[PDB]
Amino acid sequence: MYNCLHSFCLSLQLEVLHSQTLMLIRERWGDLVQVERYHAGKCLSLSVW
């Protein structure tokens, strides 16, 4: 039970963070941050400066 609901919640958190980065790139930042890698449920990697 812990494995199933912990894995789902953590990948949900990663999906929320990816959606937030797409909001920041579209609205206010824009090429000051870029998504390098995104594997859904596995990893997210952003590039600044």
Binding site: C4, S7, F8, S11, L12, E15, S19, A40, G41
Partner: peptide
């Protein structure tokens, strides 16, 4: 006499949960 349209991503995550954790009767 709704659906907030961020549910595509949640649904793909549900399918990944189905695969990563299968149901067991």
């Amino acid at each position: 006499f709704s659906s907030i349209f961020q549910r595509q991503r949640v649904d793909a995550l549900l399918l990944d949960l189905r695969q990563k954790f299968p149901p067991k009767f």
